[PDB]
């Protein structure tokens, strides 16, 4: 089932085991795959036959490797055929193929240089997002207030259509400031940090705007949120069907 | 038993038609002429003023013949036109 892309150079997989093990304990059969070591490409379709049902794209640093492995015109055709997708990004990791694919969906992530920052924060060292910013009850509804840890996040702009499902928000004060003299990508609460998307065929994509959200070093603050977002992404939390009309 | 029916099939003679289909239009026209050359006399008899019993008799006696001839022309003509029997 699930496929797991990663890049040892950018982010080692050893810091994401806790969640993938949690997937292996729920009957998922996931095949690990490297980005550069394997010169041979992976085959999502063979003669109009979808092989895998899920994809997890851990952070990468662009390059021609990813672009060879899964081009846009193939990833769109895979996602359209009821193939769920998880996708991560960060100002240190912005794959061009991912950016173009998301732009084709309707989500616009930030570019490489731009990074979000918030001066009104309890912890100056990294980003702490309050649990009051949850925007969609079906994905995750906070039973009790908590603080999700993010680090060097990158907010995204959203178009105005009926499929996009905002899941988290950025604090109103926060703003993206790039190194160069480029205009701020997103100002205020208009910038979203975690964004879902549901196809018309009930396929589901989830974009997480930080590489530090799913790391195993942060499992005391945002454990339940991640374990519910990974359930929603793989079509096993909120699925509805009508039996007799 | 398929074997014995298949044995009886080949042994027997073939089918000889009663009146060949090539000479049926001739009988069709030669009966169409007669079946109206007679059925006009029927209408003349019924129209003519005479005894009722004699009218009935000379109507039915030459109406039965016209009936038979028409009922035997309407088969030859139907076969000749391409709609068999």
């Amino acid at each position: 089932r699930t496929l797991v892309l990663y890049d040892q150079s950018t982010e080692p997989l050893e810091e994401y085991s806790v969640y993938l093990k949690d997937l292996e304990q729920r009957n998922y059969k996931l095949e690990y795959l490297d980005i550069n070591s394997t010169s041979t490409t992976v085959d999502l379709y063979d003669k109009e036959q979808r092989l895998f049902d899920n994809i997890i794209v851990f952070p990468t640093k662009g390059g021609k490797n990813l672009a060879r492995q899964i081009p846009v015109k193939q990833l769109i055709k895979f996602f359209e055929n009821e193939g769920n997708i998880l996708c991560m990004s960060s100002p240190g990791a912005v794959p061009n193929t991912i950016r173009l694919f998301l732009n084709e969906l309707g989500i616009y992530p930030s570019p490489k240089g731009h990074v979000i920052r918030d001066y009104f924060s309890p912890s100056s060292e990294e980003l702490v997002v309050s649990s009051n910013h949850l925007l969609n009850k079906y994905v995750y509804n906070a039973r009790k207030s908590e603080d999700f840890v993010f680090g060097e996040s990158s907010a995204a702009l959203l178009e105005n259509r009926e499929q996009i499902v905002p899941i988290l928000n950025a604090p109103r004060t926060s703003f993206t400031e790039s190194k160069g003299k480029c205009n701020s990508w997103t100002s205020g609460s208009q910038g979203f940090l975690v964004v879902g998307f549901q196809n018309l065929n009930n396929a589901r994509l989830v974009w997480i705007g930080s590489s530090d959200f799913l790391k195993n070093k942060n499992q005391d603050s945002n454990q339940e949120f991640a374990k519910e977002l990974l359930k929603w992404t793989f079509n096993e939390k909120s699925v509805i069907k009508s039996v007799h009309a | 038993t398929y074997e014995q029916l298949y044995k009886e099939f080949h042994s027997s003679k073939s089918f000889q038609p009663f009146i060949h289909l090539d000479t049926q239009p001739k009988f069709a026209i030669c009966g169409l002429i007669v079946t109206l050359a007679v059925l006009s006399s029927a209408l003349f008899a019924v129209g003519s003023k005479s005894s009722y019993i004699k009218k009935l008799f000379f109507y039915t006696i030459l109406s039965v013949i016209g009936s038979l001839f028409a009922g035997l022309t309407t088969v030859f003509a139907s076969n000749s036109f391409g709609v068999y029997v």
């Binding site: - | 029916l5 038609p17 049926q24 009936s67 035997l72 068999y84 029997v85």
Partner: protein, 434 residues
Amino acid sequence: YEPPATWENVDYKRTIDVSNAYISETIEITIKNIASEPATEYFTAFESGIFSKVSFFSAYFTNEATFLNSQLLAEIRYGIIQFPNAISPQEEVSLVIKSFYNTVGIPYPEHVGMSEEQHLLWETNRLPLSAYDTKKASFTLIGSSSFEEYHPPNDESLLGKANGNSFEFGPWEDIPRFSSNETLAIVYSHNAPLNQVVNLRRDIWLSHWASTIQFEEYYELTNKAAKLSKGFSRLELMKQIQTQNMRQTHFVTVLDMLLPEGATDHYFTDLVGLVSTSHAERDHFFIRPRFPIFGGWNYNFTVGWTNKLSDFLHVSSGSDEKFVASIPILNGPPDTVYDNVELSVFLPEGAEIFDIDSPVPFTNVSIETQKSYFDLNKGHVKLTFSYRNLISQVANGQVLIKYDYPKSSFFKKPLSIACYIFTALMGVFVLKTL
């Protein structure tokens, strides 16, 4: 249910020919009897899926041309073979079985352009599925240019050996009974149009007055080949036929009906009227549909003709009023497959059936009456058979009807019209004299 183990296959070589749009299996087996009371039986094993669609099952000795009483039964299922003479307790006899299935491989890519070649995928069992212990077994595929496997097994022994015109398999020295744990799947090239007649109903109108027998058939034809991607485009079609590329394309452009010896008054009709692209040469009726039948397209049409009656009836010997008719059961395109056949024979107004025999086991037989032109009482006598699975050129038989038609009812046909005309005249008389 398992049959009492009584025989041992001392040789088992099977060949499958996939060259003519239906799987034709031919197994040659030498068989030995277990030392016991002489038994006269044999149970060939068909899988429950394949057995649902099988249209011909014969079995004969190699030495003797004559066949045996091969019969199907009524979750592995079985077919019964029975020998004329009881086999000795310890004897060795060769035998050959021929089966004709009705399933062809599905198109593998399923979306091909109208100029590309299509490949088909078929799923069978590698190791022989028999009800007895087999000693030696070999498997062979023929009838295609190129073969390939699909998810091949790691074990080298279970791997096909390619040949120039065939795809063989290595002989296995010892195989246990009821072994069906390996589902082989193989792809092969095939460029035929893969016709399939979803419903055929053919009427045969006997007639003694005109002495002609006329056939009328109503085909519902579906192409099963790989559908075409990007949709239809007349530009590509009319640009490829102007080059020499109409060799063995997988869409139907012209059908070739094979009629009886001397036919006349051919016609080819369609639901929306008359089709003018037909051509009747000697003993051959070429038909061009309105549109070329690509993969997945349906065409329903009608075709009819007329024959002399002297070739199909025979008057009996003892009496001159007992007739025997031998109606052909199928004559259509060269290699099709029929999923339903409804054969109706319309004997004349006053016939009365005495015997009915068919060379292929039918599903249902019934007798009714249906009125036609100038049928003023009880019409014609319709006798309808319903067959289920039939092949085009190997299910060649002749239905034998035996009836009687007395002259006391041969001449009632003009009298039944004379009665109406006489009644009309005697009514006009009363209406005019009153």
